[PDB]
Amino acid sequence: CGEQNMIGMTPTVIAVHYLDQTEQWEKFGLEKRQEALELIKKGYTQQLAFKQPISAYAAFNNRPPSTWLTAYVSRVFSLAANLIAIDSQVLCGAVKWLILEKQKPDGVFQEDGPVIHQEMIGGFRNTKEADVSLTAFVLIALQEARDICEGQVNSLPGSINKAGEYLEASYLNLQRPYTVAIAGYALALMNKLEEPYLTKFLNTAKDRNRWEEPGQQLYNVEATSYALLALLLLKDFDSVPPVVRWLNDERYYGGGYGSTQATFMVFQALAQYRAD
Amino acid sequence: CGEQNMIGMTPTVIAVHYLDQTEQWEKFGLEKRQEALELIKKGYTQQLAFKQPISAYAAFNNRPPSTWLTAYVSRVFSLAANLIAIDSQVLCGAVKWLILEKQKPDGVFQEDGPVIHQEMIGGFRNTKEADVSLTAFVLIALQEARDICEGQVNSLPGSINKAGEYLEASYLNLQRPYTVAIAGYALALMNKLEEPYLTKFLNTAKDRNRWEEPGQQLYNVEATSYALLALLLLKDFDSVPPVVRWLNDERYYGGGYGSTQATFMVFQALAQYRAD
Numbered sequence: 001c002g003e004q005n006m007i008g009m010t011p012t013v014i015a016v017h018y019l020d021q022t023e024q025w026e027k028f029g030l031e032k033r034q035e036a037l038e039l040i041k042k043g044y045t046q047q048l049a050f051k052q053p054i055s056a057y058a059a060f061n062n063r064p065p066s067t068w069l070t071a072y073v074s075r076v077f078s079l080a081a082n083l084i085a086i087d088s089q090v091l092c093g094a095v096k097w098l099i100l101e102k103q104k105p106d107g108v109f110q111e112d113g114p115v116i117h118q119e120m121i122g123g124f125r126n127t128k129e130a131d132v133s134l135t136a137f138v139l140i141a142l143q144e145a146r147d148i149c150e151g152q153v154n155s156l157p158g159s160i161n162k163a164g165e166y167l168e169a170s171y172l173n174l175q176r177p178y179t180v181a182i183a184g185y186a187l188a189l190m191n192k193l194e195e196p197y198l199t200k201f202l203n204t205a206k207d208r209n210r211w212e213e214p215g216q217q218l219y220n221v222e223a224t225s226y227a228l229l230a231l232l233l234l235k236d237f238d239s240v241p242p243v244v245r246w247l248n249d250e251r252y253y254g255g256g257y258g259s260t261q262a263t264f265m266v267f268q269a270l271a272q273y274r275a276d
Numbered sequence: 277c278g279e280q281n282m283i284g285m286t287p288t289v290i291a292v293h294y295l296d297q298t299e300q301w302e303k304f305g306l307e308k309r310q311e312a313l314e315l316i317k318k319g320y321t322q323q324l325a326f327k328q329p330i331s332a333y334a335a336f337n338n339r340p341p342s343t344w345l346t347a348y349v350s351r352v353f354s355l356a357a358n359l360i361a362i363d364s365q366v367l368c369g370a371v372k373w374l375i376l377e378k379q380k381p382d383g384v385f386q387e388d389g390p391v392i393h394q395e396m397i398g399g400f401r402n403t404k405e406a407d408v409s410l411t412a413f414v415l416i417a418l419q420e421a422r423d424i425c426e427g428q429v430n431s432l433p434g435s436i437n438k439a440g441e442y443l444e445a446s447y448l449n450l451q452r453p454y455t456v457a458i459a460g461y462a463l464a465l466m467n468k469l470e471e472p473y474l475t476k477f478l479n480t481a482k483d484r485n486r487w488e489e490p491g492q493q494l495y496n497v498e499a500t501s502y503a504l505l506a507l508l509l510l511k512d513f514d515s516v517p518p519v520v521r522w523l524n525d526e527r528y529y530g531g532g533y534g535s536t537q538a539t540f541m542v543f544q545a546l547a548q549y550r551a552d
Contacts, residue, residue, distance in 0.1 A: 011531035011535075028491070030491070039533045215303065218305075254529060255531015257308075259530070
């Protein structure tokens with residue numbers, strides 16, 4: 001499957017993370033966590049069958065590697081490392097590949113092998129401002145992999161810093177609410193989400209509770225989650241409530257077609273809101 | 277996969293059904309419905325690879341058939357028939373098998389080949405009062421298959437009627453809120469959810485908004501959905517609001533481990549509430 005495996009394991013990975021972080025296993029069923037973990041273990045091991053000699057991933061071992069997919073595996077695996085035993089070699093191998101292979105001198109990340117399952121990449125599917133969409137996504141995944149990989153890949157901080165500058169250089173001119181949300185969060189992780197970019201980020205929201213694009217329900221849940229995470233990072237608990245409320249009302253569709261990004265992001269964001 | 281295929285396609289099938297029935301594709305994205313339908317088409321065709329010569333299903337073609345799984349396929353396919361083209365021979369073949377092969381003279385349905393994925397069967401996993409759990413579940417699936425199969429399997433109404441009597445005969449003595457909920461709905465479909473059984477059904481709810489079992493979040497969403505459907509059938513719009521509100525607040529986990537039954541049931545129930 002390669003891509004589908006990541007689609008299938010996502011809901012469980014982030015659900016355990018959410019129940020863990022919010023300490024709500026009592027209501028859920030404490031005896032259920034081990035079986036969930038076994039599912040995650042199966043998914044991680046299954047994904048290794050698709051790790052190419054380069055440490056990158058693709059739907060099939062015969063298919064050229066996807067920059068987005070490899071970054072998503074690093075994003076999931078970085079989070080799953082707190083739940084199951086993940087091999088550092090595997091996670092940091094992918095990180096290394098992205099940095100040394102897919103980043104341009106201006107900090108941009110490029111996709112040379114588009115995923116077949118375009119419904120699993122969220123708002124990134126809309127190609128408008130995809131350079132900023134991919135760069136922020138990759139930057140975010142790299143940030144999330146720092147805990148484990150920075151020590152092994154000392155080039156990680158630099159790649160991340162260059163990515164952020166590219167984002168900074170193109171932030172104000174962005175037209176897409178989705179891109180403003182994802183790059184906003186990435187800039188916040190960079191501690192760069194200030195003044196000019198700050199009002200640009202906030203002023204892109206509708207009713208100050210969502211970063212919405214017409215007729216794109218799931219893109220909006222995902223985007224608003226990134227935004228919620230950014231606001232949490234800024235500790236702007238002033239605009240947090242409205243966002244959490246809306247995100248909370250979204251009729252998201254868990255294991256449904258096209259819901260991979262919004263599932264991961266909504267629970268990561270809601271979990272973060274509680275832990276914050 | 278056999279069992280996993282049904283687990284994987286469930287969220288999309290009921291999501292399309294829900295968005296269809298509630299007419300909310302505008303917000304979701306009208307151009308997204310066709311790709312979802314293609315996913316459902318892939319799932320249905322994939323499931324046919326697991327239809328045994330007997331028209332029954334199991335995780336593998338080498339594995340003896342599961343009564344519950346075959347009934348769940350009938351339940352999903354009956355609903356999916358309104359979304360994609362489903363072969364009557366396939367659906368009714370399974371229905372026939374259940375009736376002529378798995379029902380005992382007292383109306384009870386028996387499971388001779390337990391599913392491997394016990395996390396996909398919801399509250400039925402708890403073996404307490406499993407005879408009533410399985411009989412109600414199968415009865416419900418058979419009821420839902422009536423539209424298409426009753427004309428081809430004239431023995432269907434009788435099997436259903438015998439099943440309901442078995443449930444009636446054991447309703448009052450039930451201890452489990454989950455079993456009271458599922459059998460309650462089945463009795464309501466039977467137009468048998470009256471007086472003695474009625475107060476038994478209602479009085480099993482907590483705060484008149486949920487049929488809860490301690491530490492079983494997902495069993496409770498599922499059971500409360502069956503209960504909500506029963507209430508809708510009785511047109512007792514008095515106790516409906518509180519139930520809908522709670523069901524609505526449940527942090528259900530879409531494509532997560534152990535969420536197959538609650539996903540299908542919550543959206544079927546919430547969709548019905550709207551259309552009602």
